[PDB]
Design a protein around this ligand. Structure first.
Ligand SMILES: *[C@@H]1O[C@H](CO)[C@@H](O[C@@H]2O[C@H](CO)[C@@H](O)[C@H](O)[C@H]2NC(C)=O)[C@H](O)[C@H]1NC(C)=O
Ligand SMILES: *[C@@H]1O[C@H](CO)[C@@H](O[C@@H]2O[C@H](CO)[C@@H](O)[C@H](O)[C@H]2NC(C)=O)[C@H](O)[C@H]1NC(C)=O
Ligand SMILES: *[C@@H]1O[C@H](CO)[C@@H](O[C@@H]2O[C@H](CO)[C@@H](O)[C@H](O)[C@H]2NC(C)=O)[C@H](O)[C@H]1NC(C)=O
Ligand SMILES: *[C@@H]1O[C@H](CO)[C@@H](O[C@@H]2O[C@H](CO)[C@@H](O)[C@H](O)[C@H]2NC(C)=O)[C@H](O)[C@H]1NC(C)=O
Ligand SMILES: *[C@@H]1O[C@H](CO)[C@@H](O[C@@H]2O[C@H](CO)[C@@H](O)[C@H](O)[C@H]2NC(C)=O)[C@H](O)[C@H]1NC(C)=O
Ligand SMILES: *[C@@H]1O[C@H](CO)[C@@H](O)[C@H](O)[C@H]1NC(C)=O
Lengths: 170, 50, 106
């Protein structure tokens, strides 16, 4: 609040304007970064209420209805594990909307495959989507269909191991 | 207002139904990327002192 | 990476201090519902599409390419046989046409 200090600071010109403009550019760049990363879909997709995906379990990555934050258990664990003229501007996208964007992406990639990323969301059963992905890496569909239960069990075990590894490693 | 993220779409998922496209659109989109700037050179002695 | 949709091709255009890419892409349109199955059960054998997908309009079963609706008769030329019908979950019963079958009959 010293007026003499500001009077002496006026001799240096527009340094303060340059610093404010650089910080403003950084601040809008952060919102642009979040917009480019998470807002890649303009349709907010939802999963069906019945979670019949041919034995595949997505409860650890789908949003939990019991939680007020509407986050997944993995996302809840991730948020728990991260801990004078100065102002902190809030981000343009709140954590709830970023969680909603990730939920929309998860619903799109579970219910519609990769079709929603290239156009309208075309529904497909998940054991058929997995077979298409198996054909993408050069494995025949029959291998996926015959061993669908084993692959579903391995996928669920791997997701549980991911949650355990995140919870057990600082 | 509180901004809407997108239009709400509920995918009609079931374990035995698929959606197959019957038509297509040839879509052309623009992408603008900067390549270079103006090449500026400053004579340091002339700028400071003339 | 090269526009929204399935990328077909691109065109470069010069711009002042920049480049403009005209991305020509393929967007699916006018989607239609069909009843689908992973495999076709015929003669105690499981049939899987070589490159397409089994679809049904309600009464009849066909095989089509994944990105465009083009129904064709389910034959041995576009399907392959692996195993019986006891393993695949959701296999349905339908006939599989044989192109060689009218030839040896005549
Ligand atoms: C998907 O995975 C979740 C998580 O393991 C399963 O939920 C468990 O269900 C058993 C049996 O009801 C309970 O004893 C556990 O306490 C549950 N765990 C959690 C974290 O909720 C769920 O059963 C699995 N299957 C489906 C279809 O959702
Ligand atoms: C495929 O079938 C489903 C359900 O039979 C259709 O989904 C319904 O669409 C109408 C109109 O768009 C909505 O009013 C309903 O709420 C939808 N139901 C559900 C459960 O989402 C779907 O539109 C059909 N596909 C096409 C291309 O028409
Ligand atoms: C696929 O879509 C195209 C356009 O997206 C359809 O072409 C139109 O057809 C109607 C009637 O035949 C004409 O009145 C329009 O002028 C056509 N538009 C263009 C741009 O050519 C075409 O008929 C559609 N095909 C199917 C099978 O649905
Ligand atoms: C599913 O598609 C098939 C193929 O077009 C339909 O079968 C034809 O239906 C027409 C009109 O009913 C008949 O005139 C043809 O003789 C049928 N062809 C054969 C080989 O049977 C079938 O009706 C369609 N089913 C539904 C429910 O739309
Ligand atoms: C698909 O075809 C198989 C084989 O013809 C059917 O399996 C038979 O079902 C009858 C009815 O219960 C049994 O008496 C036979 O013993 C079964 N045979 C075998 C080899 O398992 C099957 O029911 C058919 N499914 C549908 C939906 O039509
Ligand atoms: C598909 O779901 C219906 C009811 O939800 C059920 O009767 C049928 O057995 C299921 N089929 C498969 C292959 O899961």
């Amino acid at each position: 609040d010293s007026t003499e200090c500001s009077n002496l600071l006026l001799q240096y010109g527009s340094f303060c304007t340059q610093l404010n403009r650089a910080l403003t550019g950084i601040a809008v760049e952060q919102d642009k970064n979040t917009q480019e990363v998470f807002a890649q879909v303009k349709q907010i997709y939802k999963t069906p209420p019945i979670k019949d995906f041919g034995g595949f379990n997505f409860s650890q990555i789908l949003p939990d209805p019991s939680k007020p934050s509407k986050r997944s258990p993995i996302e809840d664990l991730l948020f728990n594990k991260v801990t004078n003229g100065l102002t902190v501007l809030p981000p343009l996208l709140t954590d709830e909307m970023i969680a909603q964007y990730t939920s929309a992406l998860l619903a799109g990639t579970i219910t519609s495959g990769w079709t929603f990323g290239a156009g309208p969301a075309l529904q497909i059963p998940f054991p058929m989507q997995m077979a298409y992905r198996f054909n993408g890496i050069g494995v025949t569909q029959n291998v996926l269909y015959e061993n669908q239960k084993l692959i579903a069990n391995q996928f669920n075990s791997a997701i549980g191991k991911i949650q355990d590894s995140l919870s057990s490693t600082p | 207002y509180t901004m809407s993220l997108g239009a709400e779409n509920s995918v009609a998922y079931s374990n035995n139904s698929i959606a197959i496209p019957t038509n297509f659109t040839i879509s052309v989109t623009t992408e603008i990327l900067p390549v270079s700037m103006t090449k500026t050179s400053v004579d340091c002695t002339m700028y400071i002192c003339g | 990476f090269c526009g929204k949709g399935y990328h077909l091709m691109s065109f470069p255009q010069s711009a002042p201090h920049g480049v403009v890419f005209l991305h020509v892409t393929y967007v699916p349109a006018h989607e239609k519902n069909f009843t689908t199955a992973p495999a076709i059960c015929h003669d105690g054998k499981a049939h899987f599409p070589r490159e397409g997908v089994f679809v049904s309009n309600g009464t009849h079963w066909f095989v089509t390419q994944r990105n465009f609706y083009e129904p064709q008769i389910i034959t041995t030329d576009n399907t392959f046989v692996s195993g019986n019908c006891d393993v695949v979950i959701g296999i349905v019963n339908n006939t599989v046409y044989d192109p060689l079958q009218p030839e040896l009959d005549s």
